Amino acid sequence: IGQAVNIRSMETDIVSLDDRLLQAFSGSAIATAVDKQTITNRIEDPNLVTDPKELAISQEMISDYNLYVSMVSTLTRKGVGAVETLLRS
Amino acid sequence: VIGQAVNIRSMETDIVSLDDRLLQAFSGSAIATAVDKQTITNRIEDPNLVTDPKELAISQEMISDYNLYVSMVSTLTRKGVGAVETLLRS
Amino acid sequence: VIGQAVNIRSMETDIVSLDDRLLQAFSGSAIATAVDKQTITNRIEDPNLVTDPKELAISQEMISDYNLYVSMVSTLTRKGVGAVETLLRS
Amino acid sequence: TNRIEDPNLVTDPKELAISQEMISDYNLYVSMVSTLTRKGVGAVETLLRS
Amino acid sequence: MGNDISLIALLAFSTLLPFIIASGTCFVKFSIVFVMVRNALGLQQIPSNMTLNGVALLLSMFVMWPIMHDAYVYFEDEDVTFNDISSLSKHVDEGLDGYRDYLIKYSDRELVQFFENAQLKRQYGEETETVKRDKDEIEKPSIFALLPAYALSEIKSAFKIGFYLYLPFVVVDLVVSSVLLALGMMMMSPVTISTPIKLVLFVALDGWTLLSKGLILQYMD
Amino acid sequence: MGNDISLIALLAFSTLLPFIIASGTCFVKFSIVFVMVRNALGLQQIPSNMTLNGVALLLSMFVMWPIMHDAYVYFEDEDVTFNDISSLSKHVDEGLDGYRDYLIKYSDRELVQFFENAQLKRQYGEETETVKRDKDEIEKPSIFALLPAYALSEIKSAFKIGFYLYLPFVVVDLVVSSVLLALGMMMMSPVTISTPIKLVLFVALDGWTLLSKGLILQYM
Amino acid sequence: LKEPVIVSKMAARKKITGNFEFHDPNALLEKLSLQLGLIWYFDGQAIYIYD
Amino acid sequence: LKEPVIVSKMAARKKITGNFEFHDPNALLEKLSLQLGLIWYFDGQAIYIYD
Amino acid sequence: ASEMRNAVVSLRNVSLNEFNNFLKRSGLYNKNYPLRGDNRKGTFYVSGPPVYVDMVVNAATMMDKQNDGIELGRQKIGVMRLNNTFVGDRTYNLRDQKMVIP
Amino acid sequence: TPWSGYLDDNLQTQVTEALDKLAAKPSDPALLAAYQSKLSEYNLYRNAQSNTVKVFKDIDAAIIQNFR
Amino acid sequence: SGYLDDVSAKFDTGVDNLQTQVTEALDKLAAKPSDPALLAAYQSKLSEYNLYRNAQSNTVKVFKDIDAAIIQNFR
Amino acid sequence: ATPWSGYLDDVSAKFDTGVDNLQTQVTEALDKLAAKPSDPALLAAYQSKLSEYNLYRNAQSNTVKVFKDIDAAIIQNFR
Amino acid sequence: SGYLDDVVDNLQTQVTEALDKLAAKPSDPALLAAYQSKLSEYNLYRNAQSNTVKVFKDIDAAIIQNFR
Amino acid sequence: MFYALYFEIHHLVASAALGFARVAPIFFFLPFLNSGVLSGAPRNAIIILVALGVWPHALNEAPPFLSVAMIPLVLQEAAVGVMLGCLL
Ligand SMILES: CCCCCCCCCCCC[N+](C)(C)[O-]
């Protein structure tokens, strides 16, 4: 049990369009990197891969990860898909 | 049979704009859905309901109906927007 | 052998519009299907029919035939629609 | 075939393997004619504009 | 759904829907009138087709919505209504009269009669008496015969409307050309001068208001 | 992923997005104005439509950004409790008012009101005395009434701007024709003499900067 | 009548003119129901009128 | 006839001209059937005429 | 004023008046928008400004959930002496039959 | 789910009852012979039911997935 | 009708009378449950029945799966 | 006529998460049995509890699996 | 067939014949063991045929679409 | 006979396809039909409907041309359509 939280993380005002990207990109890449790591070290630990109460947690974590990355991919593709049609047309 | 209600009269179309009828349809569907998901989840935890053969035969039907309902709506909406794409992009 | 009937000279001096040919086909199929589903369910409910080998061996064939029929109608319909799309679509 | 032999042979695996060939080939033939006519008309329009 | 064939038919219909809108709804007419206006002003690429088709589809929604809603509640209606093949085929057929009444109300009687007779002569043979229903109650004609008559009727009337709108700009063009020849500037391309006069004329008329009003009032009393 | 019917609604909206931009945003106007500049200068193929549309799309984002930000934080960031049809309907509707107000700022009232009455379809053919040209409002018209009135207003505004832009270049070439007829040289077309003059006039005016600035200033 | 009245979208298309006396509304309502072709009901809280 | 009459769409395309009595309809109806090429049935509630 | 919120709450473990005491100690109570219901039962209606409604609904739901950890049913033991009879069961071996009195 | 507009539990109680009789005297051969039959029939009933409900789900899903 | 019923029937026209014999032997045995002569016959008939019904059902299952594969490859 | 909407207990479930009685009781029964593996009264109890725990855990896993396939199938329907 | 029109034996026959022989005596191990392998070989043949017909049609459909 | 409706739909689309070759050139010449006016998704939908409205034979029986080389035939029909477009 060793835990830390970073609290003063984000600015809520209206801000230039360039930086909303950097801040979204960075926060997302960080979240996915740590999520993936915790998944793998839940499988490598023998006390967690063999307990039926723990496996049920790992199942949810894996599924949530799958869905989150599927959705960020889909919406980004439709985002650039709009621009390319307005410009080509 | 424990508690039930029904809505008897639907408001006249003569006083409601075209987009109100949409908001009103959407909201009703989104709520009936969240309520069904919750109901199923609660049936899976009451130890009396999760271990009685009589009750399981009900849970299996409830989950099959939820699955078909959401697959239906998600298909027809995709066909609906595909029509607009076909007419405008073309 | 029970209650057999056949129409004769169906097309010999009258021809239906396609508009009607589709409609008769749809109706004749949809009702036969709904009656077969009820027959199956009833053969499952009756305590004397789900416990006798002779009656179970009959019910297995009914379920097999229903499943094959509905799958064939669905596949042919989808394939035939596809061709009209490839014709009309610019 | 209209009211001779029998209908509904959805079920015998030997005739059901003969129907697969026909049901496919006629769909391909009809699909091909649709393209050839567009090509022909397009060639005429191309020459007449130019 | 309570029945599987009822589902298959619904997915087929939802797969062919756009062509029915493209060929059997006022969209076919609005789309033409706006392109005619753009031709009249002598423009090439602006407004874009995507913008003109956008407004054309929105305006078509106000006109078609009531019969689509009517058909929807008619087929949802939960009260017991049919029992057997003849009652089902009549129930389905009866559900389409809300839309046959629409096609018939705007199709040209002469075209409807032509496409009907030419089907009778296919099915029953050309020796069957040519009907000449000159005073007529057209006996619920088949929708495959009724639909192309509507399509050509809307094309006719849209062209007709588009003609009227040219005549002011035609005047503008011939006038400008005459005054330039009166000055002898034979080498001046008139289009450079006449384009802005057309634009300011149309803006002073407020064309899009008048036009979008009248186009809708033609479909409702 | 929350409620999945809200997920379906989000993906649908995301698919229709380019047509909404193409018909309910000032992109409509900027796209037309820049092309008319090219026609008034009489150039047939340069700059590319790829370039002109890219610029118009960029500029319009500055104007629309303040609204999308507010809608986002209102819907997605705030967790809220709601429990029934009426509470949800009202909650959803209230989020759109930020956009609704923009449309009503740039749309023309009698046309919006006509479309409203057309979609109620009530008692129709209501007369001009059913209206009295009122001035100050707490009405909330439908968005399906507001979108086309907006489109049809923006287009007319663009045409008006295009009227003024043509005039100086029209003067520039009738002068050239008159000088060539003062000489004997009536066999020669003005165009090859006239084009460079128009290009210098336009650069001396720096028309691109005045245009972009003034187009933005209308929406501030 | 002392009751709120709800009129169907269809019945609201009809028009009327003249000088009327609402002396006994239940009776007048019954009268005009048949002349104009309406139908009506009363649940105890409001009066609903249809074509 | 004292019974409602239903005529099929196809049979409704024929035309007739002249001056008729209808004195004994059941007999007349039969005679006309064979001249025009019609067939007809009677269930007890309505008379159905077809080509 | 058009922003007023209203909600129905149902509690299983806590009485309405018990919740009132919580609000009063908190210094959150507001006599313009008081709770309406049966002091003795667990169901009530509340309406008011957004902040107040949300806080009430959350607080009450958490109170009710936490009281699933409390217990009421403490057993008690009674010791009762019999004054007129023997506590135990008896068996009478009749020379012909064994018979039992419980 | 009803097809809109179309015109057109005892075994559980019986097994419960037989169980209650048996529980009172587990050594009676007649109560044992009866319970064996009731329990066997109930078992077969529940299995046949749940297999059929799955077969219908899978046909509806295949139909949708064909046009989806 | 159908081919899968044709396959099912090709068994029932194969075992002419077994369906009757089994019930008849059961009635006899039930009349005198302790006769070894009866018992010995019933054991045989019952076994022959159990086997017939299992072979029939597994064959119908296999031909059903062959057809369900072909109707998918129609697509 | 239409069925009622229902009403949504939005807050309750997500913070109703907490240590289940059922696992606690399973581990307690096992610890009682392991002290005297030959007592029939304890064996009879543990058979029942372990069985119920098996059923519960399977039913839950299969349900989570079903609910997430629907969401993956929606997203794959629109991309 | 008995017929040729002018202008060995296959698994389809052998299966029908072995089923026909088996159904006369469903409890003989020689016949059962002779039938298992014919029904297996017929299942494999009838799958492999359909899968390759499907491949050749998808090739031709892709060609026509590529020249659209 | 089970597949007869499926084949009957394919006979329909083969007839419409061979009719398009003769009807579309007319739509090219006339001043109220050319693509300066009628364009996008309506265009094909309308041409096909007209061609089916005028095809001379019952739509539900097999097309007679299945035995013939397709190109000479398509060119023949397009030439006929061009001649009619001129005369109209
Ligand atoms: C037909 C007369 C054309 C004269 C030039 C028109 C103005 C543009 C070019 C000169 C601009 C003045 N400047 C900046 C050089 O001083």
Side-chain angles (χ1 to χ4, degrees):
Chain A
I1 303 171
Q3 299 179 130
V5 178
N6 296 34
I7 65 177
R8 191 188 160 245
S9 65
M10 179 60 65
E11 297 75 36
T12 61
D13 188 26
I14 297 178
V15 71
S16 68
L17 180 58
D18 190 353
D19 291 31
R20 216 71 183 175
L21 283 177
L22 296 180
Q23 299 302 89
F25 175 79
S26 309
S28 190
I30 290 289
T32 67
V34 306
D35 199 1
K36 192 175 178 294
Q37 285 173 13
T38 63
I39 300 162
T40 54
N41 73 36
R42 285 191 129 261
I43 309 302
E44 292 179 5
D45 179 352
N47 196 35
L48 270 52
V49 80
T50 75
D51 182 348
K53 182 261 290 179
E54 300 294 345
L55 285 169
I57 297 167
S58 305
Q59 186 192 340
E60 297 163 22
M61 298 172 68
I62 296 163
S63 307
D64 294 339
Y65 180 91
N66 171 57
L67 296 165
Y68 180 80
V69 177
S70 299
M71 190 170 297
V72 172
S73 179
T74 296
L75 300 174
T76 305
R77 176 59 186 108
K78 290 185 182 291
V80 303
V83 177
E84 67 181 332
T85 65
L86 292 174
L87 303 182
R88 284 203 179 80
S89 73
Chain B
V1 304
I2 288 165
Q4 285 293 274
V6 295
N7 180 22
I8 290 296
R9 197 184 78 91
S10 183
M11 193 179 301
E12 285 64 35
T13 54
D14 206 22
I15 69 187
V16 179
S17 80
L18 188 66
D19 72 32
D20 291 306
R21 280 188 277 272
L22 307 188
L23 289 178
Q24 204 281 346
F26 166 83
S27 308
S29 189
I31 299 174
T33 302
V35 172
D36 295 355
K37 194 172 200 166
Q38 200 59 51
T39 306
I40 298 158
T41 307
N42 296 350
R43 297 184 64 83
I44 303 297
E45 302 194 327
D46 181 342
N48 198 71
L49 302 180
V50 79
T51 78
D52 184 350
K54 184 178 171 74
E55 304 289 349
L56 290 165
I58 299 170
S59 308
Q60 187 191 345
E61 288 201 284
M62 289 183 66
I63 196 168
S64 300
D65 289 351
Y66 176 90
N67 178 13
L68 296 177
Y69 183 74
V70 180
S71 303
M72 196 71 208
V73 178
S74 53
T75 304
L76 297 175
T77 46
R78 181 59 184 91
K79 298 285 179 179
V81 303
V84 180
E85 297 191 274
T86 308
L87 299 166
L88 303 182
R89 189 171 297 121
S90 309
Chain C
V1 298
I2 317 93
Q4 285 293 352
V6 176
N7 274 264
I8 298 299
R9 75 185 293 271
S10 183
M11 292 278 283
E12 298 297 3
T13 79
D14 188 5
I15 293 184
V16 291
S17 181
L18 186 86
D19 189 16
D20 295 325
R21 178 61 195 279
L22 291 176
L23 182 60
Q24 303 311 320
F26 166 84
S27 307
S29 185
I31 289 177
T33 289
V35 173
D36 293 347
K37 192 177 282 185
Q38 289 294 352
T39 303
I40 295 170
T41 311
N42 294 6
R43 287 186 65 77
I44 305 300
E45 301 313 314
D46 181 347
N48 196 271
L49 296 183
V50 296
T51 63
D52 180 344
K54 189 189 181 83
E55 297 297 338
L56 285 172
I58 283 170
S59 308
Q60 186 185 358
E61 296 164 18
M62 296 195 187
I63 299 175
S64 302
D65 290 341
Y66 183 95
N67 183 356
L68 290 177
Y69 176 82
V70 176
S71 302
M72 179 71 97
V73 175
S74 180
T75 308
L76 299 176
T77 310
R78 178 60 187 83
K79 205 178 184 99
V81 171
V84 175
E85 293 194 65
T86 64
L87 179 63
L88 300 178
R89 186 176 291 278
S90 181
Chain D
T1 302
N2 285 98
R3 191 29 62 175
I4 182 60
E5 207 68 25
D6 62 6
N8 198 256
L9 192 48
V10 182
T11 62
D12 179 317
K14 190 197 174 70
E15 200 90 357
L16 198 61
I18 296 170
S19 308
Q20 191 191 343
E21 293 270 32
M22 293 176 63
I23 287 171
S24 305
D25 277 33
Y26 200 48
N27 192 70
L28 291 174
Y29 182 91
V30 167
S31 186
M32 180 188 68
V33 176
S34 308
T35 66
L36 294 177
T37 64
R38 280 194 274 262
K39 299 301 190 189
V41 173
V44 171
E45 290 186 345
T46 295
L47 291 169
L48 293 179
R49 289 196 193 105
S50 312
Chain E
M1 269 293 202
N3 171 272
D4 310 280
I5 288 73
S6 299
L7 177 59
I8 297 167
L10 175 61
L11 295 165
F13 174 69
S14 302
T15 299
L16 294 175
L17 186 67
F19 309 106
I20 295 159
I21 296 178
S23 65
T25 289
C26 56
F27 177 78
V28 74
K29 169 163 173 175
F30 288 105
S31 303
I32 292 172
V33 177
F34 298 157
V35 169
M36 291 276 182
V37 174
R38 193 176 69 191
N39 281 271
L41 298 180
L43 302 182
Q44 291 278 39
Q45 308 178 22
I46 43 156
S48 72
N49 308 56
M50 192 153 56
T51 305
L52 298 184
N53 296 354
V55 284
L57 187 60
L58 285 162
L59 297 188
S60 300
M61 201 75 88
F62 306 153
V63 177
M64 300 308 290
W65 176 256
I67 77 175
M68 293 199 295
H69 177 67
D70 170 48
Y72 184 87
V73 302
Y74 175 85
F75 284 116
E76 278 199 332
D77 219 353
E78 301 193 39
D79 57 318
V80 181
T81 303
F82 60 86
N83 171 59
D84 189 34
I85 184 169
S86 61
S87 72
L88 177 58
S89 54
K90 287 179 178 181
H91 171 80
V92 173
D93 196 334
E94 199 280 347
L96 302 178
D97 285 346
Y99 180 63
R100 284 186 182 104
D101 181 21
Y102 172 84
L103 296 176
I104 291 167
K105 190 175 189 292
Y106 296 98
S107 299
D108 280 344
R109 175 170 55 222
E110 199 63 62
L111 279 172
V112 171
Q113 176 180 352
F114 175 87
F115 292 116
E116 173 63 323
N117 293 329
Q119 173 155 33
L120 300 180
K121 294 187 184 290
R122 277 208 293 266
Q123 283 163 233
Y124 302 104
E126 296 178 38
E127 289 291 341
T128 55
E129 59 285 351
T130 303
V131 183
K132 291 189 178 182
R133 201 78 193 235
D134 306 330
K135 296 179 178 67
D136 55 340
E137 181 269 320
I138 305 181
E139 305 192 64
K140 55 172 290 188
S142 177
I143 204 159
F144 273 63
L146 184 63
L147 192 58
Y150 177 75
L152 294 177
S153 301
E154 295 287 35
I155 280 168
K156 193 200 80 192
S157 70
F159 195 88
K160 198 169 165 188
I161 292 165
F163 165 82
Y164 280 106
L165 291 168
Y166 269 61
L167 299 167
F169 314 107
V170 166
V171 174
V172 172
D173 278 326
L174 291 169
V175 174
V176 168
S177 188
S178 301
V179 178
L180 289 171
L181 290 176
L183 295 171
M185 287 189 282
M186 305 153 284
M187 305 309 295
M188 266 293 292
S189 302
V191 64
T192 313
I193 302 186
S194 67
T195 299
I197 296 175
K198 297 183 183 172
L199 290 175
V200 77
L201 181 55
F202 188 84
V203 169
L205 285 164
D206 200 45
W208 299 120
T209 305
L210 304 176
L211 182 59
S212 65
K213 284 178 175 181
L215 283 166
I216 288 177
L217 286 167
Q218 292 197 335
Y219 289 95
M220 59 179 71
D221 54 293
Chain F
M1 284 293 180
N3 187 337
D4 52 281
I5 288 183
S6 306
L7 175 57
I8 294 165
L10 178 56
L11 296 170
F13 169 86
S14 306
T15 307
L16 302 172
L17 193 70
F19 315 117
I20 295 154
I21 300 164
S23 75
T25 294
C26 61
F27 176 76
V28 172
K29 183 177 179 173
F30 304 169
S31 306
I32 306 168
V33 174
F34 302 151
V35 172
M36 291 192 301
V37 174
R38 192 181 67 200
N39 290 342
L41 294 170
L43 300 179
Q44 298 186 86
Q45 296 182 325
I46 47 159
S48 174
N49 290 16
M50 284 275 280
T51 299
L52 301 178
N53 298 357
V55 179
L57 188 57
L58 280 156
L59 303 186
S60 60
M61 285 290 144
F62 307 161
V63 179
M64 305 308 297
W65 179 253
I67 304 161
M68 307 188 292
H69 189 284
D70 278 348
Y72 178 87
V73 302
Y74 176 79
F75 280 120
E76 209 67 28
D77 194 349
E78 294 306 320
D79 58 309
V80 183
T81 189
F82 43 76
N83 323 116
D84 63 29
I85 299 166
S86 306
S87 64
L88 181 57
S89 307
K90 195 176 306 184
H91 172 70
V92 175
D93 177 56
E94 196 284 323
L96 308 174
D97 282 340
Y99 183 60
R100 175 183 281 116
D101 187 45
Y102 166 97
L103 301 176
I104 198 52
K105 184 178 177 179
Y106 309 107
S107 312
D108 290 346
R109 186 189 169 287
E110 280 60 42
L111 182 58
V112 183
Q113 186 166 33
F114 177 85
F115 291 138
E116 280 283 29
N117 288 278
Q119 67 177 12
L120 300 186
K121 211 169 178 178
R122 77 202 306 193
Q123 195 183 323
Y124 209 72
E126 283 218 293
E127 69 270 29
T128 58
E129 189 163 319
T130 69
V131 166
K132 288 299 299 185
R133 181 40 192 80
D134 198 11
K135 194 186 70 190
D136 301 332
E137 299 305 342
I138 64 173
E139 292 174 1
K140 302 294 172 181
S142 170
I143 281 176
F144 292 139
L146 286 168
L147 278 163
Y150 174 83
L152 300 177
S153 308
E154 299 298 50
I155 299 162
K156 195 187 62 172
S157 309
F159 292 180
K160 193 174 236 170
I161 301 164
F163 175 70
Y164 307 95
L165 285 161
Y166 269 87
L167 296 166
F169 310 115
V170 167
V171 177
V172 163
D173 74 38
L174 283 172
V175 175
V176 170
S177 304
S178 303
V179 174
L180 290 175
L181 260 65
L183 309 179
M185 298 200 283
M186 73 202 81
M187 286 304 307
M188 175 158 55
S189 66
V191 185
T192 63
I193 295 186
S194 189
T195 303
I197 302 170
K198 302 177 176 180
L199 303 179
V200 293
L201 185 63
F202 203 63
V203 309
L205 292 165
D206 199 43
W208 295 106
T209 82
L210 296 178
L211 283 164
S212 56
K213 295 179 187 177
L215 286 165
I216 298 290
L217 298 164
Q218 300 185 359
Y219 296 88
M220 311 292 84
Chain G
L1 287 158
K2 309 190 173 193
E3 311 296 331
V5 193
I6 309 148
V7 179
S8 168
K9 175 262 191 170
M10 191 172 298
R13 295 179 179 150
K14 291 171 158 69
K15 305 293 195 62
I16 190 165
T17 51
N19 184 355
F20 294 88
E21 187 195 60
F22 302 141
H23 175 253
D24 179 11
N26 312 277
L28 189 67
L29 178 69
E30 272 297 289
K31 210 77 169 297
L32 298 174
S33 299
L34 294 174
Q35 290 175 341
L36 304 184
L38 307 173
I39 75 176
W40 72 280
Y41 176 65
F42 174 70
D43 78 340
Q45 301 77 250
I47 307 170
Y48 318 78
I49 296 178
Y50 299 86
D51 188 291
Chain H
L1 288 163
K2 303 172 185 181
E3 295 294 316
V5 187
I6 307 156
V7 185
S8 83
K9 189 191 179 189
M10 186 140 66
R13 297 178 185 136
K14 313 183 194 304
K15 305 298 194 57
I16 200 160
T17 303
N19 190 0
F20 311 83
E21 292 200 318
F22 313 149
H23 185 64
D24 185 14
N26 302 290
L28 185 58
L29 180 61
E30 286 166 7
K31 188 168 293 181
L32 290 171
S33 299
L34 295 178
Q35 291 183 342
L36 310 180
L38 316 168
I39 75 179
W40 72 282
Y41 178 66
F42 176 66
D43 78 338
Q45 305 64 235
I47 305 169
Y48 305 76
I49 311 174
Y50 305 94
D51 188 287
Chain I
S2 65
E3 310 189 72
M4 280 282 289
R5 301 286 153 89
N6 56 57
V8 173
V9 187
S10 184
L11 313 179
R12 195 161 180 66
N13 298 328
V14 183
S15 317
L16 179 64
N17 76 81
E18 299 172 77
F19 192 66
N20 283 335
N21 303 336
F22 166 80
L23 300 177
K24 286 172 179 181
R25 293 174 180 275
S26 308
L28 304 171
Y29 177 70
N30 195 334
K31 68 184 181 183
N32 308 275
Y33 308 103
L35 311 188
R36 296 195 168 287
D38 187 333
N39 314 66
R40 320 160 303 148
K41 314 304 184 177
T43 302
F44 69 87
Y45 171 88
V46 55
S47 68
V51 179
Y52 177 70
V53 178
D54 299 343
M55 176 284 293
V56 166
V57 172
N58 284 279
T61 304
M62 300 304 189
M63 281 279 192
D64 193 67
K65 248 65 191 181
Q66 297 299 359
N67 284 33
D68 288 357
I70 303 300
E71 184 51 50
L72 280 65
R74 302 199 189 82
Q75 312 298 277
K76 85 180 298 179
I77 297 171
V79 180
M80 291 188 283
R81 185 187 171 105
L82 306 187
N83 312 278
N84 305 315
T85 198
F86 304 89
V87 296
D89 54 356
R90 309 197 66 73
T91 312
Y92 297 87
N93 178 48
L94 321 174
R95 196 175 286 168
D96 314 316
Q97 177 186 18
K98 294 199 71 176
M99 175 281 285
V100 187
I101 311 178
Chain J
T1 303
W3 187 24
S4 59
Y6 185 50
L7 182 61
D8 293 354
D9 296 344
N10 305 80
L11 194 56
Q12 185 61 98
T13 85
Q14 200 141 42
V15 178
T16 302
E17 174 60 8
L19 181 53
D20 296 0
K21 283 177 152 54
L22 189 279
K25 201 182 294 294
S27 60
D28 194 326
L31 301 175
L32 293 166
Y35 190 61
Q36 189 203 344
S37 303
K38 319 322 298 191
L39 193 62
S40 297
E41 298 186 352
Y42 183 80
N43 186 316
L44 300 167
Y45 169 62
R46 288 288 174 227
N47 280 127
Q49 190 180 63
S50 307
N51 290 0
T52 304
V53 175
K54 191 185 179 185
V55 169
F56 295 145
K57 181 203 172 184
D58 291 345
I59 294 165
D60 286 299
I63 290 165
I64 293 161
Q65 202 277 330
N66 201 7
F67 285 87
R68 188 186 182 103
Chain K
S1 194
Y3 183 62
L4 298 195
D5 183 35
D6 194 21
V7 171
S8 182
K10 214 169 179 178
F11 288 89
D12 295 354
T13 72
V15 289
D16 302 336
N17 197 21
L18 183 61
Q19 182 59 71
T20 296
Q21 296 179 10
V22 298
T23 76
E24 188 168 273
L26 179 57
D27 294 337
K28 288 184 175 187
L29 182 60
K32 202 177 287 276
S34 59
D35 188 348
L38 303 178
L39 294 166
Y42 193 57
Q43 180 194 5
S44 309
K45 302 297 170 184
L46 192 59
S47 303
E48 283 290 1
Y49 197 70
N50 190 349
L51 295 173
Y52 148 58
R53 286 286 176 214
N54 269 97
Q56 182 178 63
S57 184
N58 291 1
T59 303
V60 171
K61 168 76 176 193
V62 174
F63 281 96
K64 190 266 180 179
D65 290 343
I66 292 176
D67 294 339
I70 296 173
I71 296 178
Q72 286 195 100
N73 282 337
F74 279 22
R75 293 176 296 163
Chain L
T2 305
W4 190 242
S5 59
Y7 199 81
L8 180 64
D9 195 14
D10 187 8
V11 174
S12 186
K14 72 177 185 175
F15 212 80
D16 198 3
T17 298
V19 295
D20 64 304
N21 308 75
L22 184 60
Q23 179 171 31
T24 306
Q25 291 189 269
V26 167
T27 312
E28 177 176 51
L30 175 58
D31 289 339
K32 286 188 175 187
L33 176 67
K36 193 173 289 195
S38 58
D39 185 354
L42 301 182
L43 290 170
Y46 189 62
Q47 184 206 351
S48 197
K49 294 165 191 166
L50 182 59
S51 297
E52 298 182 348
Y53 190 55
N54 195 323
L55 301 170
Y56 165 80
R57 194 64 70 193
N58 291 1
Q60 189 190 64
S61 185
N62 293 354
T63 304
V64 168
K65 174 60 180 163
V66 170
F67 292 134
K68 298 187 185 285
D69 289 352
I70 317 304
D71 297 347
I74 287 161
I75 295 166
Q76 189 153 102
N77 200 19
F78 282 93
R79 61 164 178 191
Chain M
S1 64
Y3 168 39
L4 289 303
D5 202 87
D6 308 339
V7 291
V8 74
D9 213 350
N10 56 27
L11 283 170
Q12 157 65 33
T13 306
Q14 298 176 48
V15 171
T16 300
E17 190 278 358
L19 165 61
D20 195 37
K21 190 173 291 165
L22 171 68
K25 197 161 61 179
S27 54
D28 182 333
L31 270 46
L32 290 173
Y35 182 54
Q36 189 208 341
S37 62
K38 299 298 181 186
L39 187 63
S40 295
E41 289 179 355
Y42 187 72
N43 185 318
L44 292 183
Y45 168 67
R46 197 60 81 182
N47 274 97
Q49 187 188 17
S50 183
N51 281 7
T52 54
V53 171
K54 170 61 175 164
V55 170
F56 298 139
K57 310 308 173 180
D58 289 352
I59 298 161
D60 295 344
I63 290 166
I64 296 165
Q65 187 172 14
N66 191 28
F67 279 100
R68 189 175 182 164
Chain N
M1 167 42 170
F2 187 74
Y3 302 102
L5 180 61
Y6 172 87
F7 290 107
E8 281 178 33
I9 295 299
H10 287 287
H11 301 327
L12 168 61
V13 294
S15 305
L18 189 62
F20 178 97
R22 193 163 170 165
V23 183
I26 297 152
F27 284 61
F28 179 87
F29 289 95
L30 310 187
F32 53 86
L33 299 182
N34 64 78
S35 59
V37 171
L38 176 62
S39 64
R43 190 176 179 75
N44 286 3
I46 305 161
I47 303 170
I48 298 290
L49 290 169
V50 171
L52 287 180
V54 303
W55 187 254
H57 301 161
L59 294 172
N60 75 301
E61 62 179 40
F65 60 75
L66 296 182
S67 57
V68 185
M70 288 301 301
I71 293 176
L73 183 60
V74 172
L75 300 193
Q76 176 201 274
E77 298 307 287
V80 175
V82 171
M83 185 78 265
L84 285 174
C86 296
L87 294 171
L88 290 169

